[PDB]
Subunit: 115 residues, 4 copies
């Protein structure tokens, strides 16, 4: 699995469960063609987004639907979504975890890149 997503909730100290995640890749014509998506699991994780064959170098965007998550808990949020835009770079063996930590008015994201 070359690309995983992991989301945490800073208010509840828990995985952020049932969070919608969309991944896009920059296309020839500079358009963000949908690439993959899913909903975080009970552990706050989303695996199986893509395969190594499909996950070529390129610019990618991972959009995390944070606004719907906070609405489902009844907490007024600032952002429409959290967005993580990065270039995948095919330098030998590499797996990518995009982690996000959510609060109503803040978020952090980190990339954990391993061989």
């Amino acid at each position: 699995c070359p690309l995983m997503v992991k989301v945490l909730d800073a208010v509840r100290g828990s995985p952020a469960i049932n969070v919608a995640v969309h991944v896009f890749r920059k296309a020839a014509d500079d358009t963000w063609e949908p690439f993959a998506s899913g909903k975080t699991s009970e552990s706050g994780e989303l695996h199986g987004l893509t395969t190594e064959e499909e996950f070529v170098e390129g610019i990618y965007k991972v959009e995390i639907d944070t606004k719907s998550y906070w609405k489902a808990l009844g907490i007024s949020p600032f952002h429409e979504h959290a967005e993580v835009v990065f270039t995948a770079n095919d330098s030998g063996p590499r797996r990518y975890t995009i982690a996000a930590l959510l609060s109503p008015y803040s978020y952090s994201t980190t990339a954990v890149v391993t061989n």
Copy 2:
């Protein structure tokens, strides 16, 4: 001043100086229209992007060009940029400060919204 941006560098413990910042506003046809842009000052701040008149309700995207910054420091970062997308002014006019904290493989963003 209703929209300010503040950038910090988590590696040097300093303001993130001369960082490019572009603001877009979502238009009628779900296209992102250029709204305002500038560069952070020596204090890592960017003021005077807009006016209370011009800064109507809408969905805004504040794109902070973090890759060019880290590059200029001789570091190949993970992200292309930090992007913060939010509805503004939807319960009336407010003053928004968008803060970002930058590392090569991570960033954090918070909004401070006042009367």
Copy 3:
């Protein structure tokens, strides 16, 4: 002003107001001695803790009383407080800003150090 503290609330998107802050300095016998204390203002800032004279080289601990803050908001947070421990002034006198970003189950802290 060589030591300032800035607190933000990631849940309300506001400064974290009236937050208690205690500073200690490590003494000769590896005991923490009371150095200075105060509460954040309406802007979430705490200035005038010390003077350039009094603020000598040493190991300092800035304890931010985050539990009492979240309690006063009706939230039972994870942490007892945020604690930031650092050597100060060890390459000469500097100006230190300790920023913290608070959620119930998470916090972030950064130092901005200038001439």
Copy 4:
């Protein structure tokens, strides 16, 4: 395993490997008696710190030796260590993960608490 620690490196986008972690518990006489410790693994994790029998309600401190980590990479850091102080609360089934994300001049910590 009732208490785990996980540390990430924001500069390198990697687990923070071989990082010293000490856990202390507040003692009768308000002293921080060493409770457990170890070094993060290749995955940035530390498990097996304590057992459910031993991990009673109480105030705990998890000290992460961030300064030695940054020194081993040759990057000047601000903090002496990252410290996470919290009360363990014995409310039914609960496991605690203390996650920390490190940069030279900043860190974030989060508690992920599951049943």
